[PDB]
Amino acid sequence: AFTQAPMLEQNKQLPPVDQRLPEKPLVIKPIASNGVYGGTLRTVMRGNADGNGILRTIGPQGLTHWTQDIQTVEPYVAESYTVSPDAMEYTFKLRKGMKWSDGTPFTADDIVFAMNDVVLNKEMFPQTPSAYLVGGKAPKVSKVDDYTVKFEFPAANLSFPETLATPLGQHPTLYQKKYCSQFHPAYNKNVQAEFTKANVKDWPSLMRAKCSDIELPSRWSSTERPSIDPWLIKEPYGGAVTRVVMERNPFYWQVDPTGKQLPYVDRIQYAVVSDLQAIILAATNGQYDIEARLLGSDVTSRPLMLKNQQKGGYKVFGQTSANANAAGLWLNQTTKNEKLRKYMTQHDFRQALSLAMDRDEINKVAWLGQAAPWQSGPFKESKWYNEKLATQYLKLDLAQANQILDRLGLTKRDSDGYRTYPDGGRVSLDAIVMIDRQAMVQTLELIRRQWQKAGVELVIKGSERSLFYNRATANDYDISIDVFPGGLDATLNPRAYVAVHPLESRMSLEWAKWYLSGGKQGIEPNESMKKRMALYDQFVAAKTQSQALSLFKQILQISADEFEVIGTVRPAVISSLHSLKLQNVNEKMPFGWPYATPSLSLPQQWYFSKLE
């Protein structure tokens, strides 16, 4: 018989555990050992809209879920699914008896509401999230019965199960129809009465504030928003809090092999900390049972973490990052600096900037020698490896860089020795970066000095998150600095190779807006990018794995020929930690947002061997 956490035995209002669970709960097979109930997991997030820290701790609860080796997905929220021979129809069978956190039924009505009334509603999302599209076209999503939902695409969509396992593909299970319909004008003609109580002026803002979206802080800022998550918000996230607390969902829909309703751990407490230096200190002091997101990407923290393992009572584990590059230069093909744009669009200008960089020095100084020079291409640990895309223009060659820049007409010099435009002033590139990402900032400081030898001025524009993203969406930057994805799975995140991501394809978000709107908005891309966008749509719609392989390789080939974005180093090891007493953490898991790590490791089966 199923059993429950002692904490839930305390609640006289709850139904018995066999009535709270689905008839067939998902049986979780723990990473290392069957666990024991109890305890509070201590972890950490930042203060300014770092809500993805909660999502990456508890896990997206999607229709499918990655396996630990990230090669495939398995049914997760769905008990099972079928794919039609032509790969156009996916039919998901849901777990009869499954309930939301409020005890009400989780059924096909919720998934159909999430898709048809939220995701595919053009007032809510003027451009539909591409996770659900093939060639810009939406699926027909229908209820078959109370526990069966069908997604019917107009072309083959082989990659849909994988998309459904990423954070961005979790909308189908994010919205309880009962609660959320109160805030939707198709359902509630008195919705305007909700505007004043929520401090909004229109219904999409009301929906975002109350029912939320994947990455909105409002996802974690209330206690009344129902979910199917393993823990539920009890002390909410907000603009100026110092901790967040979540407690177990009494209606969680999973058991372990002995029949225990999960999670094992009763509670998660997030410290909310503004400065990364304070997080380092608290982590080395042993105040966190897990930190696998904030400290690992700046390798300068690794010696400190390793040295303090005994003092803090934790074990460091190294994860392989899925990103192809730790600090990539996303050159803006649509920069509003028109004199600079005329150079940004020249292949040889981009080549020269790469040849003027000293990646061995960047590695030694900013990455402690633990990274390696790399451009933007997939790794040899992937079937998408392209030698040119990974390795072209990596070695410092200032003689050639300076000859190229001369040939491109940048021979007129200012009194400080810098090159100037043929009809303008100093060649000066504004690079936006998140100022808290100190290894990226140090990398930029090294490039700034290196590019002086080419007579090119790099201006570092470091800021907090909101200004960084607002500059990007406003097309207000010459270079944007952030990771290049695609080292391990280029097809999940192809944004460095083709401009399809509305916020992160920063070779031009205006090109991305053109792609996503079918050419109605944004800026029409050049011929090579339009070709890659058409190939991308062919790839998503491929009828067979072999066709998908050829089409996607063509995209990478063209991206290699164009050399639109410039890498510095591929990631060093990502250093994560867990308390010595915290069991069932998969220390072998890769690191990455598409897997929502560390939650890839199934936090609902983490447990404490001993408390303190």
> What is the binding site for Ca ion (CB under 5 A)?
71, 158, 348
CB of 88 to Ca ion, least distance (A): 5
Give me the least distance between CB of 82 and Ca ion, in Å please. 12
Nearest to 578 by CA among 366, 377, 319: 319
Determine the 3-state secondary structure of 6 from DSSP: helix
CB of 490 to Ca ion, least distance (A): 11
535 contacts 561 by C-beta, under 8 angstroms: no
The SS3 of residue 422 is coil
Phi, then psi, of 113 in degrees rounded to 5: -65, -50
Residue 54 makes CB contacts below 8 A (sequence gap 6+) with: 45, 219, 220, 237, 244, 246, 270
Taking the complex as a whole, how short is the minimal distance between the CB of residue 293 and Ca ion, in angstroms?
Answer: 24
Residue with smaller CB distance to Ca ion, 386 or 579: 386
b (16+ CB within 10 A) / e for 229-259:
bbbbbeebbeeeeeebebbbbbbbbbbbeee
Q: Is the peptide bond before 30 cis (omega within 30 degrees of 0)?
A: no
Closest CA relative to residue 110, chosen from 178, 13, 17, 205: 178
Pick 71 or 415: Cβ nearer Ca ion: 71
Give the shortest CB-380-to-Ca ion separation in angstroms. 5
Cis peptide before 75 (omega within 30 of 0): no
Q: Give the whole-angstrom CA distance, residue 254 versus residue 130.
A: 30
Read out DSSP for 346-407?
-HHHHHHHHHT--HHHHHHHHSTT-SEE--SSPPTTSTT--HHHHHTT-S--HHHHHHHHHH
Task: Find the shortest distance in angstroms from Cβ 74 to Ca ion.
Answer: 12
Of 202 and 381, which CB lies nearer to Ca ion in the complex structure?
381
Nearer to Ca ion, 13 or 71 (CB): 71
In sequence order, the β-bridge partners of residue 18 are none
- Minimum CB separation of residue 492 from Ca ion in Å reads 9
Nearer to Ca ion, 310 or 545 (CB): 545
User: Shortest approach of Ca ion to residue 298 CB, angstroms?
Assistant: 30
For Ca ion, the closer CB: 179 or 497: 497
- Closest to Ca ion by CB, 71 vs 190, is 71
Residue 162 CB, nearest distance to Ca ion (Å)?
5
Q: Which CB atom, from 311 or from 380, has the smaller least distance to Ca ion?
A: 380
Task: Spell out the residues 6+ positions from residue 467 whose beta carbon is closer than 8 angstroms to its own.
Answer: none
Q: Least distance to Ca ion from the beta carbon of 354, Å?
A: 13
Give Cβ neighbours of residue 586 (< 8 Å, ≥ 6 apart).
Answer: 31, 68, 600, 601, 602
Judge whether 61 and 68 are in contact, CB under 8 Å: no
Please say which residue, 159 or 420, places its beta carbon nearer to Ca ion. Answer: 159
Name the minimum Å distance from CB 552 to Ca ion: 13
Closest to Ca ion by CB, 250 or 502: 250
Calculate helix-pair angle for 545-562, 527-540, nearest 10 degrees: 160
Listed residue (473, 495, 482, 391) closest to 434, CA to CA: 482
Which candidate, 97, 89, 58, 94, places its Cα nearest to that of 76?
Answer: 94
CA 509 to chain centre: 17
**Cβ-based nearer residue to Ca ion, 71 or 310:** 71
